[PDB]
Design a protein around this ligand. Structure first.
Ligand SMILES: NC(=O)C1=CN([C@@H]2O[C@H](COP(=O)(O)OP(=O)(O)OC[C@H]3O[C@@H](n4cnc5c(N)ncnc54)[C@H](OP(=O)(O)O)[C@@H]3O)[C@@H](O)[C@H]2O)C=CC1
Ligand SMILES: NC(=O)C1=CN([C@@H]2O[C@H](COP(=O)(O)OP(=O)(O)OC[C@H]3O[C@@H](n4cnc5c(N)ncnc54)[C@H](OP(=O)(O)O)[C@@H]3O)[C@@H](O)[C@H]2O)C=CC1
Ligand SMILES: NC(=O)C1=CN([C@@H]2O[C@H](COP(=O)(O)OP(=O)(O)OC[C@H]3O[C@@H](n4cnc5c(N)ncnc54)[C@H](OP(=O)(O)O)[C@@H]3O)[C@@H](O)[C@H]2O)C=CC1
Ligand SMILES: NC(=O)C1=CN([C@@H]2O[C@H](COP(=O)(O)OP(=O)(O)OC[C@H]3O[C@@H](n4cnc5c(N)ncnc54)[C@H](OP(=O)(O)O)[C@@H]3O)[C@@H](O)[C@H]2O)C=CC1
Lengths: 245, 243, 243, 245
């Protein structure tokens, strides 16, 4: 149908080799987008190419590296034209209580989960602004809003993603670009967590289950759609009731 | 496709004769739902029947009247079985600065915009809970979260809708029912040239939203795909407010 | 000192016979305010007069009764002049899961916990606006923001208090009146051994709050120092929720 | 009185040489605290010593420098014992629209306004946790929550401060330490802004005026008080109605 249809749009999804990023890439391609997913290695990029088939391709990207970012965008732009939908999914955890938290575990989180969104967003935004159409969608976390002990660095980065999102949303709203965050709760990815730890996390989820990566993909696809043009500066929580704002 | 597919679901959309409620009803029917839309008059109900065709029908409903609510649900339940998706859209404004605000302008807002959601939600929830599947989606307002001068009654009701939503979401999450709010900004609907520019001035998007844009957000939350969203307020306001 | 000094201010604290309302009344009187606390009975009013001594007095008030409200304000206004600080503390619970929730348990909550704030606020606001100085401070609840299963009515009312607060804050900010909400978590007050540990389990602080801790937050917002805070919800809940 | 009394508490207030940080330092000293305020130079430190008199002193601190931080805390700890109240006030702006925003304007904001709070908080928290009593109060900004065009970096840092605050609040609540943010709106400091720009900002303030630095000091003093023990993980907005959460 013409409902939630991304035909003619070019989507870049960072960290698309597995889990949530993969589900996002697959669903955007199902809705008609031409999708470039990224991994940190060529092997990972190839596997992304393998699952996207004629609907897009894989490329190697380190989101902390300016020259990598430039190489990937020029390659995309040459072949596909300018990016219409940016999904900043790539991210990491470096968990520790503050008294144990290393300088590098702080800085690596800031770099990968926050500074990267500044860099990538800045590198796609000019085209979007010229076309008067764009989507920037960040994958945040319930922890960004809720906080979590042992994840102060992660929480800071994810919270900063929202502050950036709101500010960019104000900056570019008049030129037809939206900027938003999807904040997952606990999603099956998480596996191999102790039996003890899962039940304890699950105990805080009214839904009484982990979310599926597809459920995060669906929310992203929605915000990426033409139908979602009047949503901007928003944080959409998909966490089974774990937190309610 | 199977994507955002509501075939087999029965949807009740209150206040579906025009604007946002109409757009909601049309979109849910387009995605496959069997839709009952309501108006406050039989004429209104007929027009709703006219635009839904074989995808549903219209019925007369006053959401402040227990006996009307009971009559409508029994009629729906007899013909279509139990409601799968409840869209509480019906609502009104009774604007005034507090010093000018009449007892009835307060109470009519509380009754129409808030107590109604308690009544209707309670009247569909048992079936949903038995089937272990349900959607309750409330149409709120940016004013519920932002506040607005001259709309304290409206803001109170719309804010109370969220408190109710969050509490019902906790209550029914383990039995597969989601409860959520969609909060529109300023949408081109029935409700000065001067006042519009002044409102628009607070919208970064630099336009009013279209009713279809509110419909799209509701359809999304109504979908099987939106099962892990509950207790949420989804803001569709062009950047007018950002939480 | 001149720090957090309420000398010369007239404070009305509804539901001041015990718990949080009592602690509020005592603290505002300690900071220099002339305090009228209320209870629902004359016996309760007398006890309030007993603990306030020369710093204020007690009066009987039912916040759901227009004529009671009018009688109390005229009496205050005659004796003490117009109210400078309004603390809307009076409130109740009528807990039940939605499927068990009676029409009266809904309506009694709406009336006592929400409509009352419209009535009382409207009845003090004109004077405050004329003097270009005022404080309206509502006692909400973490449940207003968090939701709680079995308390959908309460949550709706307490959430609606915020919508009202934000709208009134916009309406009266230019005339020097602030309107705010203090949202307690679980506080040691009248309201199982099992249920307490379960509630405590959700409090990082690992204890219930003291009524005095809610009093302190109210006194702060009531102060001249808090003039640039308005439309705010100040959460005092030991980490139970974090917005 | 015993109401809002900080006698016996040691307070460290970063960036206390002027405006909000100065007003904070003065008010905490008025309520009985022993106050160490900091500036980036010895001259600035001396002026802080001059206004605090016998109620505290000034020290030179660069909050982006680990060795500076260590030197200041050891000096405080030697003389006054361990810090009871930490006020992270030091911060900067590096304003620009994203397309003009330099790598350094991003990174300098992250370093000064966010990473600094990780470093300083970590360096005081052990003592607080051992004593089972502490206050960490961050000076954020309405922009952290509201977003602002031309301030995406600032907004990201200030938003990240909240994510960090919430997480630290969960981590240390059981050991009697609170962690909170005070978020000022537009405060008279701001001066020498165009006549045009002020009216435009003021137009968004229902209160119809800028806030006074003292009004931010009062909120901080409140949260620093024993009376505020049951407030943690909170963001207290003092913005004249400019934004309402
Ligand atoms: N899992 C959960 O419960 C939750 C997840 N989070 C967020 O969801 C997003 C994805 O989550 P999840 O599916 O669990 O993550 P995964 O670890 O499954 O996927 C990680 C992806 O990120 C890429 N990546 C890591 N570092 C870099 C880098 N420096 N440059 C470029 N790419 C990099 C990886 O590439 P490669 O394949 O080469 O390793 C990989 O494709 C993240 O932003 C995460 O913070 C959100 C809520 C909770
Ligand atoms: N317009 C906007 O910008 C915004 C809309 N709001 C909310 O969206 C919802 C719909 O708004 P909008 O489409 O603009 O409203 P309209 O006035 O355009 O339509 C209102 C609908 O509700 C029905 N209705 C009114 N009172 C009752 C009642 N007592 N019982 C049953 N039905 C009733 C009306 O039926 P009939 O045709 O018979 O009168 C009509 O179908 C409302 O809840 C409103 O508060 C939310 C954000 C802002
Ligand atoms: N306890 C808690 O943990 C929390 C408290 N809440 C809120 O704080 C407020 C006070 O709570 P708490 O001190 O625990 O309550 P209590 O039941 O301990 O005291 C209630 C007070 O309100 C008065 N009151 C009750 N109904 C009316 C009425 N219809 N008209 C006038 N006064 C009335 C009572 O008077 P009388 O003595 O004559 O009955 C009493 O003085 C309430 O709004 C409550 O919802 C907020 C967060 C949680
Ligand atoms: N002004 C406003 O309207 C608003 C202010 N903000 C926030 O309030 C806080 C203070 O604001 P304001 O009073 O305007 O700030 P000022 O610029 O008046 O004060 C700046 C202070 O921070 C210190 N500082 C700057 N960089 C460093 C550094 N690297 N290491 C240590 N100290 C440093 C300065 O030291 P030195 O004296 O040596 O220069 C100075 O003492 C900041 O966090 C700011 O972001 C919050 C809301 C809006």
């Amino acid at each position: 149908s013409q409902f939630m249809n991304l035909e003619g749009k070019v989507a870049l999804v960072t960290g698309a080799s597995r889990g949530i990023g993969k589900a996002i890439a697959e669903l955007l391609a199902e809705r008609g987008a031409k999708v470039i997913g990224t991994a940190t290695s060529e092997s990972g990029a190839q596997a992304i190419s393998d699952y996207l088939g004629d609907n897009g391709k894989g490329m190697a990207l380190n989101v902390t590296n300016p020259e990598s970012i430039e190489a990937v965008l020029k390659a995309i732009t040459d072949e596909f034209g300018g990016v219409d939908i940016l999904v900043n999914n790539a991210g990491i955890t470096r968990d520790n209580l503050l008294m144990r938290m290393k300088e590098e575990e702080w800085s690596d989180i800031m770099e990968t989960n926050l500074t990267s969104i500044f860099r990538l967003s800045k590198a796609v935004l000019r085209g979007m602004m010229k076309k008067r159409q764009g989507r920037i969608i960040n994958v945040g976390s319930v922890v960004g809003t809720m906080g979590n002990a042992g994840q102060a660095n992660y929480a800071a980065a994810k919270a900063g993603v929202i502050g950036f999102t709101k500010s960019m949303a104000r900056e570019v709203a008049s030129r037809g670009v939206t900027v938003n965050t999807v904040a997952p709760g606990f999603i099956e990815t998480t596996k191999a967590l102790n039996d003890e730890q899962r039940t304890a996390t699950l105990a805080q989820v009214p839904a009484g289950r982990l979310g599926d990566p597809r459920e995060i993909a669906s929310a992203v696809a929605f915000l990426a759609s033409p139908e979602a043009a009047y949503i901007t500066g928003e944080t959409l929580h998909v966490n089974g009731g774990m937190y309610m704002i």
